[PDB]
Amino acid sequence: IRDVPADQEKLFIQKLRQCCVLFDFVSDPLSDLKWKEVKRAALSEMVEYITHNRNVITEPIYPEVVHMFAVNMFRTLPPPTLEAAWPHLQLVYEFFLRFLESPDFQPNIAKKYIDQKFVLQLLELFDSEDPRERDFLKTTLHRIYGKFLGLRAYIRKQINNIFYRFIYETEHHNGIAELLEILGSIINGFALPLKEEHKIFLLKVLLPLHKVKSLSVYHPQLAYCVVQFLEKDSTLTEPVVMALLKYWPKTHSPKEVMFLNELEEILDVIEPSEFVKIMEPLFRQLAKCVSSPHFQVAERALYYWNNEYIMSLISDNAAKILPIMFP
C-alpha cells in the first residue's frame, strides 16, 4: 500500500497507524506472513529513522506513537513461557524506548498521553513471563520515572502495591526482581531526612520480602534496596538487621548463603555505633553458621574473616564478641 524519502511526517503518521493492526501469532502461526513482514519491516524502519535523523518529532506524532504502543502492548497475557508476538513487540518496545530517550523528547508534550492510566497498564505488563519483555519494561518505566515528575509519586505508590499483594494476598508476580531494580534507583533519590512513609515502606514491605519462598529469584535486588536504605539513613540499621535475623532460616539450609551475603554487604557499609547495637545477636547467628553441617554455609560465614573491615570491628569489640566466638 505505502512506500518507504519524500520529506513529510504525513506518511510517518501513516506508517505508525499501519502498525496498530494486530496479528495472530498464538493460534495460527502460519498466518498473514506477508503482512506481518510489512509491519515488522515498518517498525524496523521507524527505529532507524528516529535513531539517526533528528527533528521529526512534533506535537502531532506524539499521540500516534503512544496509541501505537498501547494498542500493541496493553493486552491480557498467556497462562518460562515466551511471547509468540515477539517479532513485533520487540520492535514496538525498541521504538518506544528510543522515542522516550530521543534528544528531541518533550516530556512537557508527552505528558498529555503518557498519563496515570498509561503507567498502570505498563505495570500490569511486568507480570509477563517473557524475560526480555520484562527487561524492556524495566528500562521503559525507569525512563518514565526519570522524565515525568508528575508521575513519580504514582509510580512509587503502585510499585509498593504490587509488592504488597505479592506478599500478603495470594497473588504472585515474577517481575519483582525487575521492579526492585527500579526501586533501588528510586531509593537513591529520596530527600534527607527520610520521609516517614519510606521508613514504613522499609519495615512493612521491603524487609518482609525476605520471607516469600521464591526469594532466590530476586534476592540480589532485594539486598541492593536494603543496603541503599542504610546508605541514606544508618539509623535504620538496627531494625533492618534484626528483621533479617528474625527471618533468618531457623532450619539449617543452603539459602542461608544469601543471608550471609546480604549481611556482609550491610557490614561492608555499617557504622561502628550501629554495629555494637547488633553485634551480639549478629555474632551468635554466625557462631551457628560457622558450625553448620551445610558446607557452603560454614564456608560463606568463614569468608567474613577475609573482610578486613569486619575483622577490625570484631577487634574493636573483642571483650564482648570473644566469649561468643566459641566458649
Swiss-Prot record:
Residues of the full protein shown: 30 to 372 of 524
Subunit organization: PP2A consists of a common heterodimeric core enzyme, composed of PPP2CA a 36 kDa catalytic subunit (subunit C) and PPP2R1A a 65 kDa constant regulatory subunit (PR65 or subunit A), that associates with a variety of regulatory subunits. Proteins that associate with the core dimer include three families of regulatory subunits B (the R2/B/PR55/B55, R3/B''/PR72/PR130/PR59 and R5/B'/B56 families), the 48 kDa variable regulatory subunit, viral proteins, and cell signaling molecules. Interacts with PPP2CA and PPP2R1A; the interaction is direct. Interacts with SGO1; the interaction is direct.
Protein name, UniProt field: Serine/threonine-protein phosphatase 2A 56 kDa regulatory subunit gamma isoform
UniProt record similarity statement: Belongs to the phosphatase 2A regulatory subunit B56 family.
GO cellular component terms given for this protein: chromosome, centromeric region; cytosol; Golgi apparatus; nucleoplasm; nucleus; protein phosphatase type 2A complex
Disulfide bond residue pairs: none
UniProt superkingdom: Eukaryota
Free-text tissue specificity from the UniProt record: Highest levels in heart, skeletal muscle and brain. Lower levels in pancreas, kidney, lung and placenta. Very low levels in liver.
Modification note: Isoform Gamma-3 is phosphorylated on serine residues. Isoform Gamma-1 phosphorylation by ERK2 is IER3-dependent and inhibits ERK dephosphorylation by PP2A-PPP2R5C.
Keywords assigned by UniProt, alphabetized: Acetylation, Centromere, Chromosome, Nucleus, Phosphoprotein
Main location class: nucleus
GO biological process: DNA damage response, signal transduction by p53 class mediator; intrinsic apoptotic signaling pathway in response to DNA damage by p53 class mediator; meiotic sister chromatid cohesion; negative regulation of cell population proliferation; proteasome-mediated ubiquitin-dependent protein catabolic process; signal transduction
Annotated organism of origin: Homo sapiens
Induction trigger: Up-regulated upon DNA damage.
